[PDB]
Amino acid sequence: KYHQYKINQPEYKAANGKWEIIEFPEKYRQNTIHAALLRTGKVLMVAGSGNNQDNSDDKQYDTRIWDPVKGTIKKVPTPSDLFCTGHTQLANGNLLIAGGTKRYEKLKGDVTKAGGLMVVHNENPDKPITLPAGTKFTGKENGKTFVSKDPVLVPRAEKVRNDPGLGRIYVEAQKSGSAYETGTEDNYRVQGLSGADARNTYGIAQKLALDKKDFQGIRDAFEFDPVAEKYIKVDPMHEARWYPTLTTLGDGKILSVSGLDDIGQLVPGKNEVYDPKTKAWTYTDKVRQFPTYPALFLMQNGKIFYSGANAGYGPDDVGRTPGVWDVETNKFTKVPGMSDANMLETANTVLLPPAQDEKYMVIGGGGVGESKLSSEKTRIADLKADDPKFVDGPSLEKGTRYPQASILPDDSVLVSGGSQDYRGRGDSNILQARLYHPDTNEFERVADPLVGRNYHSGSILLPDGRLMFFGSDSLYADKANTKPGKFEQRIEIYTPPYLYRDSRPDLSGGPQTIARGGSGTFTSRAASTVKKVRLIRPSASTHVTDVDQRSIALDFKADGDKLTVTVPSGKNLVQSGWYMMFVTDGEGTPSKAEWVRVP
Ligand SMILES: [Cu+2]
Numbered sequence: 001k002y003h004q005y006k007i008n009q010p011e012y013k014a015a016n017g018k019w020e021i022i023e024f025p026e027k028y029r030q031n032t033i034h035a036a037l038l039r040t041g042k043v044l045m046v047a048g049s050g051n052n053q054d055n056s057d058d059k060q061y062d063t064r065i066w067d068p069v070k071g072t073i074k075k076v077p078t079p080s081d082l083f084c085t086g087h088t089q090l091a092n093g094n095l096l097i098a099g100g101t102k103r104y105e106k107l108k109g110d111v112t113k114a115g116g117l118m119v120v121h122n123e124n125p126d127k128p129i130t131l132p133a134g135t136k137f138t139g140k141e142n143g144k145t146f147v148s149k150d151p152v153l154v155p156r157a158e159k160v161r162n163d164p165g166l167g168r169i170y171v172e173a174q175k176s177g178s179a180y181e182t183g184t185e186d187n188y189r190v191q192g193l194s195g196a197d198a199r200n201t202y203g204i205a206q207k208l209a210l211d212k213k214d215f216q217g218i219r220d221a222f223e224f225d226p227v228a229e230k231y232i233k234v235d236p237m238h239e240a241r242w243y244p245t246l247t248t249l250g251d252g253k254i255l256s257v258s259g260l261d262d263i264g265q266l267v268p269g270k271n272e273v274y275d276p277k278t279k280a281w282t283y284t285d286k287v288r289q290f291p292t293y294p295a296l297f298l299m300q301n302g303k304i305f306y307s308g309a310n311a312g313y314g315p316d317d318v319g320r321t322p323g324v325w326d327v328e329t330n331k332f333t334k335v336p337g338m339s340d341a342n343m344l345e346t347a348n349t350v351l352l353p354p355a356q357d358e359k360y361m362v363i364g365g366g367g368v369g370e371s372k373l374s375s376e377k378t379r380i381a382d383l384k385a386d387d388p389k390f391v392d393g394p395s396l397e398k399g400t401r402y403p404q405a406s407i408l409p410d411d412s413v414l415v416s417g418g419s420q421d422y423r424g425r426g427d428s429n430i431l432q433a434r435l436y437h438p439d440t441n442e443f444e445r446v447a448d449p450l451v452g453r454n455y456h457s458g459s460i461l462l463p464d465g466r467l468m469f470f471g472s473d474s475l476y477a478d479k480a481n482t483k484p485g486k487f488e489q490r491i492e493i494y495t496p497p498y499l500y501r502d503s504r505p506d507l508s509g510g511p512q513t514i515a516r517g518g519s520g521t522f523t524s525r526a527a528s529t530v531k532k533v534r535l536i537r538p539s540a541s542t543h544v545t546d547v548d549q550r551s552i553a554l555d556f557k558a559d560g561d562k563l564t565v566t567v568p569s570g571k572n573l574v575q576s577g578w579y580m581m582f583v584t585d586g587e588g589t590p591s592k593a594e595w596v597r598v599p
Contacts, residue, residue, distance in 0.1 A: 007447060010500070012447075013447075013495075013497070013500040014497060014500045014501055015446075015497055016445075016446045016447040016497060017446055017447050017494060017495050017496040017497045017499070017500065018447055018494075018495050018500070019447055019448070019449055019450045019492050019493070019494050019495075020450075020492060020493050020495075021450050021451060021490050021491075021492055022071075022490065022491045022492065022493060023489075023490050024073055024489075028064060028073045028074075028075065029489045030045070030047040030050055030062040030063075030064060030489070031047045031050030031051060031052060031062075031083075031456070031471075031473070031487040031489065032045040032046065032047055032050075032064070032470045032471050032489075032491070033046065033047055033048065033050065033051065033083040033084070033456045033471060033473075033542060033543075034046040034082070034083065034085065034087060034458070034540070034541070034542040035458055035460050035468070035470055035539075035540075035541055035542075036087060036089070036095050036460070036538065036539065036540035036541070036548075037460050037461065037462065037463075037538035037539055037580075038065075038093075038095070038224075038226035038538070039093045039226055039538070039578035039595055039597075040226045040227065041067075041068070041069065041462075041463050041595075042065050042066060042067045042068070042226070043065070043066045043067075043068060043460055043462075043468060044063065044064075044065055044076075044095065044224060044226070045063065045064040045065070045066055045470065046062075046063050046078075046082055046083065046085070046097070047061070047062040047063065047064075047078075047083060048061050048062065048078065048080075048081040048082045048083030048084075048085070048100060048101060049061055049062075049081050049083065049101065049104075050062060050083065050487065051083065051456065051473055051487065052487070053104060053106075056081065056101070056103055056104045057103070059081075059103075061078035061079070061080065061081055061082065062075070062078055063075065063076040063077075063078045063082070063231075064076065065229055066468075066491075068462050068463075068464065068466070068468065068493070069464070074229075076229060076230065076231070077230070077231070078231065079220070079222065079231050079233065080100055080218060080220040080222070081100050081101045081102070081103075081218065082097055082100045082220075082222075083100060083101055084099070084100055084101045084215065084217075084242045084243050084543075085097050085098065085099045085100040085101075085244075085542075086098050086099050086241065086243075086244035086245055086246040086256060086259070086293075087246055087540045087542070088246045088247060088248055088254060088540055088547060088548055089248075089537070089538065089540065089548055089577050089578070090223065090254070090276045090577065091252050091276055091575075091576035091577050091599075092223075092276065092577075093226065093577060093578045093597070094223040094224055094225050094226070094232070095223065095224040095226070095540060096221065096222075096223055096234075096246060096254055096274060096276070097221070097222050097223075097224055097231070098220070098221035098222070098236075098237055098241070098244065098246060098256060098274070099217055099218060099219075099220075099221075099237065099240070099241035099242060099243070099244045099256075099259055100217070100218050100220065100242065101215055101216070101217070101218065101242055102215070102216040102217065102218050102240075102242070102262065104213060104214075104215060105213070105214050107212050107213050107214075108149075108170055109149060109170060109172045109212075110172060110176070111210075111212075112176035112177070112210075113172050113173045113174075113175070113176050113180070113210075114144075114146070114172070114173040114178070114180045114181035114182070114208050114209050114210060115146055115170065115171050115172035115173055115208050115212065116170070116171065116205060116206065116207065116208045116209070116212055116214055117168055117169070117170060117171075117205060117206070117214045117264055118137055118146065118148070118168070118169050118170070118171045118188065118203045118204070118205045119166055119167070119168055119203065119204045119205065119263065119264070119265055120152060120154045120166065120167045120168075120169060120190075120201065120202070120203050121154075121164040121165070121166060121201065121202050121203070121204065122154040122155065122156065122157055122164055122165035122166075122167070122200060122201055123157050123162055123164050123199070123200040123201070124156060124157055124162075124165075124196070124197075124200040124201075125156055125157040125158065125159050125162050126156065127156060128153060128154060128155050128156050128165065129153075129154050129165075129197065129200075129201055130151055130152065130153050130154070131148065131151065131152050131154065131169070131190065131201075132148075132151050133148055133149055133150050133151050134147055134148065135147065135148045135152075135190060135191070135192070136190075136191040136192070137171055137188035137189070137190055137191070137203045137205075138188060138189050138191060139182060139186035139187070139188050140186060140187045140188065140189055141186050141187070141315075141316075142182050142184075142186050144173070144180060144181075144182055144208075145173070145174065146171035146172060146173055146188070146205075146208055147171060147172060147173075147174060148169050148170070148171050149170060149171075149172060150169065150170070152167045152168070152169035153167055154166070154167035154201070155167070157200075166263065168263060168264075171203075171205070171208065173208070178209070178210060178370070181207070181208060181209035181210060181369070181370060182205075182207055182208045182209065182369065183207050183209065183312075183316075183367065183368035183369025183370065183371055184206075184207060184312075184313075184314070184315055184316040184368045184369060185204060185205065185206050185207075185266065185313065185314050185315045185316075186204075186205060186315070187202055187203070187204055188202060188203035188204065188205060189202060189203075190202060190203060204265065206260075206264070206266070206313055206314075207312070207313070207368075207369040207370070209369055209370045210370060211370055211422075211423065211475060214264055215242050215260060215264065216240065216242060216260060216261070216262050216263060216264045217239075217240035217241045217242035217243075217244075217259050217260050217261055217262060217267075218240050218241075218242075218262075219236040219237045219238070219239065219240045219241075219262075220233075220236050220237075221233075221234050221235065221236050221237055221274070221281070222234060223279075234274075234279045235279055235280045235281055236281070237256060237272060237274075237281050238270075238272055238281055238283060239256075239259070239261060239267050239270055239272065240259075240261050240262040241256065241258070241259025241260070241261070241267060242259050242260040242261075242264075242292075243258065243259050243260065243292035243293050243311055243313070243543065244256045244257060244258055244259035244267075244292075244293075245257045245258060245290075245293055245294050245295070245296050245545065245547060246274075246547075247296040247297070247298065247304065247547045248298055248547075248575050249273070249298060249302075249304075249327065250298065250302035250571060250572050251571075252276065252571070252575070252576055253273045253274060253275050253276070254273065254274040254276070255271060255272075255273055255284070255296070255304075255327060256271060256272050256273070256274065256281075257271050257290055257294055257296060258271075258289070258290045258291060258292050258293075258294055258314075258319075259292060260292065260313060266289070266291075266292075266313050266314040267289075268287065268289055269287035269288045269289035269290075270283065270284075270287055271283070271284040271287070271288065272284060284327065286329075286330040287330075288319070288325065288330055288332065289314065289318050289319050290306070290310065290314070290319035291310040291311070291312055291313050291314045291319055291320065291345075292310060292311045292312060292313045292314075293310055293311035293542070293543045293544075293545045294306055294309070294310045294319065295307040295308070295309040295310065295347075295349035295545055295547065296325075296547055297349070297351050297360065297547055297550075298572055298575065299324070299358060299383060299572065300356075300358060300570055300572045300573050301572065302572050303324050303325060303326045303327070304324070304325040304326075304327055305322075305323075305324055305325075305335075305360060305381075305383060306319075306322055306323055306324075306325055306332075307322050307347075307349040307360055307362050307381075308320065308321065308322035308338055308341065308344040308347075308362065309344055309345075309347040309348065309349045309362055309365065309544070309545065310344060310345060311345065311346065311543045311544070311545070312345045312346075312368065312369060316368060320341075320344070321334050321341075322334070322335045322338055322362075322381070322390065323335045324383070324388075335381055335383075335388050335389060335390065336389050336390070337379070337381070337389035337390035337391060338362070338379055338390045339375075339377050339379055339390065339392050340365065340375035340377050340379075342367060342368070342373065343364075343365040343366055343367055343371075343373055343374060343375035343377075343399075344362070344365045345365060345366055345367070345368055345369075345401075346364070346365055346366050346401040346402050346455075346543075346544050347362050347363055347364050347365030347366075347375070347401075347403075347544065348362070348363045348364060348402075348403050348404070348405040348415075348544045348545075348546075349361070349362050349363070349405075349545070350363070350405050350407060350413055350546075350549070351407075351549075351550045352380075352407075352413065352438045353407050353408075353411040353412075353413070353438060353534065353550075353551035353553075354411065354534070354551055354552060354553035355550040355551055355552050355553075355573060356552065356553055356568070356573065357382070357384065358382065358383040358384050359380060359381065359382045359383070359384075359438070360380065360381045360383065361378055361379065361380045361381075361393065361405075361413070361436070362378065362379045362380075362381075362390070363378050363396075363400075363403050363405055363415060364376070364377070364378075364396065364399070364400035364401060364402070364403040364418055365401065366399070366401040366421075366422065370422045371422065372421055372422070372425075373399070374398075374399030374400060374401050374420055374421065375399055375400070376395045376396040376397065376398060376399050376400065377392055377393075377395055377396075378392065378393035378394060378395065378396075378436075379391070379392055379393065380392075380393045380441070393436075393441050394436070394441060394442055394443040395443075396415075396432075396434075396443075397432065398420050398430055398432075399420050400418035400419070400420065400430055401418055401419055401420070401421070401422065401454065401455075401544075402417070402418040402419055402453070402454045402455055402457060402544050403415055403416065403417060403418035403544070404416045404417050404418070404453060404457060404458060404459040404469060404541075404544075405459070405546075406459045406460070406461050406467055406539065406546075406549065407461065407536060407549050407550070407551045408435075408461065408465075408496065408498075408590075409461075409465060409534050409536060409551070409580075409582035409584055409590040409593075410498055410584050410588045410589075410590055411437075411438060411439070411532070411534070411551065412435045412436060412437055412438075412496075413435070413436040413438070414433065414434070414435060414436075414446075414459070414467060414494070414496070415433070415434045415435075415436050415443075416432070416433035416434070416449055416453075416459065416469070416494070417429070417430060417431070417432075417433070417449055417452065417453035417454075417457065417469070418430050418453070418454065419452070419453075419454035419455075422455075422475065423454055423455045423473065423474055423475035423476075423485070424452060424454035424455065424472070424474040424475065424476075424485070425475055425476065425481060426479055426481065427476075427478070427479035428454075429452025429453065429454055429472075429474075430452075431448045431449050431450075431452060432445070432448060432449070433445070433446050433447060433448065433449055433494070434446060435496075435497075446496070446497065447494075449469065449492060449494070450492055451469070451472070451488060451490055451492055452472060452474075452488070453469060453470075453471060453472040453488070454472055454473070454474060455472070455473045455474070455475075456471045456472060456473035456487070456543070457469070457470060457471035457472045457473075457488075457544075458470055458471055458539075458541035458542060458544075458546070459539070459541060460538075460539050460541060461536065461538070461539060461549070461580075462493075463580055463592060463593040463595075464592050464593075465496065465498065465499055465504075465582070465590050465591075465592060465593075466493050466494060466495050466496070466499070467493065467494045467496070468491055468492070468493055468494075469491060469492045469493075469494065470491045471487075471488060472487070472488035473485065473487050473488070474486070474487075474488070498588055498589050498590060499589075501587065501589055502587060502589060503589075504585075504589045504590060504591055504592070505524055505526040505529060505530060505583055505584070505585050505589065505590075505591045506523075506524050506525050506526055506591065507522055507523070507524050507563075507581075507582075507583050507591035507592065507593075507594055508522065508523045508524075508594070509521065509522030509523050509594060510522070510581065510593075510594025510595050510596060511594065511595040511596065511597065512594070512596055512597070513596070513597040513598075513599060514565075514567045514596055514597070514598060515567065515598070515599055516567050516568065516569050516570070516571060516574050516598060516599075517566075517567065517568075517569040518566070518567055519564055519565065519566045519567075520564070520565060520567075520596070521562050521563065521564045521565075522562070522563045522564075522565065522581075522583075522594065523561055523562060523563070524558075524561060524562075524563050524583060524591070525561050526585065527558040527559070527560065527561050527562060527563045528558055529585040529586060530556065530558060530563060530583045530584065530585055531584060531585055531586040532553065532583070532584050533553070533554040533555075533556045533563070533565050533581065533582070533583050533584075534551045534552065534553060534554065534581070534582050534583075534584070535551070535552045535554055535567070535574070535579040535580070535581050535596060535598075536549070536550070536551045536552075536579060536580045536581075536582060536593070537549055537550050537551075537552075537575065537577065537579050537580075538578070538579070538580060552568065552573060552574055552579075553568075554566060554567065554568075554581070556583075563583065565581070567596075567598060574598050575598070576598050576599055577597070577598060578595055578596070578597050578598075579595070579596050579597075579598065580593035580594075580595060580596075581593055581594050581595070581596045
């Protein structure tokens with residue numbers, strides 16, 4: 001339009017950057033749900049079956065590697081249905097990817113009525129129990145009632161605790177509409193049982209709502225080798241997990257937390273650790289339950305910070321409170337102050353730059369399950385404070401689920417997209433982007449994104465300083481919510497303001513390996529202009545969750561055209577692995593990254 005003229009003016013791009021749509025040849029398209037920047041500089045894009053029933057039925061599983069410099073894309077053979085998986089970079093630079101989705105069950109019953117899977121428990125070792133069709137289950141907390149359509153046989157408990165018999169049955173609300181939906185797990189009383197039967201028999205269900213498909217986890221785990229460009233099978237997890245968080249501990253092992261299991265129950269706090277040297281998994285000694293994709297970050301004291309951000313599931317009163325988790329002792333200490341604590345599902349979490357400060361920001365979020373509630377708020381916790389607590393930061397304009405959030409090499413945080421309602425319901429994509437500035441605690445609006453991104457989206461900082469945005473899985477295609485949504489297969493590249501100004505500093509000397517506490521030397525003719533150096537861990541982003549990205553400040557010295565940088569000593573700050581190293585000048589303009597390996 002004229003718009004298009006406005007947003008291409010030198011002054012405009014200099015203050016707001018600019019967006020571009022990339023669309024791939026039809027043959028390379030997929031529903032990208034997970035992405036990660038690899039140490040090769042290319043982006044792993046993982047769809048699995050892509051939340052597509054035909055692909056699940058055909059075992060059609062997709063992965064791409066996309067080269068942002070050349071703009072080329074290739075397919076990668078994908079061994080398991082690796083969407084709704086967990087993932088993080090290993091010390092060797094491989095991406096550990098574990099969990100994912102079992103072949104999906106057909107959705108049954110009336111599309112206008114809340115329902116889903118009820119898992120019936122039988123505590124009686126003496127006898128099985130059959131609940132006939134039309135059995136009513138009522139939530140002990142939520143008070144809502146659902147009815148089975150078919151009989152279910154629930155086998156005897158087995159003695160060992162008795163281990164309860166379990167039987168799965170579809171249940172459905174009596175009347176249509178969202179008034180009769182639930183958003184969290186509850187324990188359901190079975191109406192019309194008396195005595196012993198009532199004592200030994202009960203239901204557990206996750207959300208029983210209108211986006212109805214029932215998903216189960218798988219145990220498979222792989223290392224993605226970015227040099228070979230292949231998935232390498234490693235030992236499977238002990239637990240099947242759909243939506244686990246994988247997060248690096250102090251000793252370099254990977255902790256896997258939560259997820260739904262092979263029958264769709266929340267894994268009840270049975271966490272496990274991958275040792276990259278043995279390529280084997282071990283249960284943790286002690287149990288702690290969280291909802292799915294919990295946002296879990298390694299702190300400099302070796303404990304885990306849980307921000308409260310999560311993708312849902314489980315009860316509303318277990319693992320819903322932000323805090324500090326000592327994995328070895330299992331002590332959990334609440335961090336108070338969170339505003340809109342009822343709107344933490346589908347929020348983003350960022351460890352603010354520089355990571356040395358241990359400040360976490362929680363952005364946006366929505367009510368449990370398919371709630372119409374959404375939060376405009378940011379909330380910041382400083383974990384180095386005497387009494388740590390969340391305090392509100394700058395607000396967004398609109399309540400926003402699913403905001404994308406990426407650390408930039410200038411210490412800004414790009415916060416972009418999202419939607420006002422569940423899965424972009426009511427055509428509620430928010431086509432806005434901001435820079436968050438940590439030092440001022442201010443938001444600055446920048447250019448609007450071109451493509452809406454809600455559920456199943458993400459963003460990835462690239463070595464050249466641009467950012468890639470992917471995904472978006474709207475429930476509906478139309479504002480009226482009458483037709484099924486189509487998965488967004490375009491990506492965008494966002495060029496920030498800092499690339500529309502003066503010449504950027506030059507940098508060469510990579511790739512290099514630099515130990516914690518060690519130093520390395522790089523070349524920059526513009527060394528004298530460098531104000532900061534940042535070692536930035538590449539992102540692995542899914543479901544509004546990225547426990548990989550962090551930006552570590554490096555001390556440096558300039559000596560003519562030579563920059564000597566020093567890596568901090570702590571293994572809890574500087575996780576082993578590969579990092580982008582950016583140098584930024586006093587005008588805030590970053591170099592392109594060189595890659596550095598920390599052993
Ligand atoms: Cu998902």
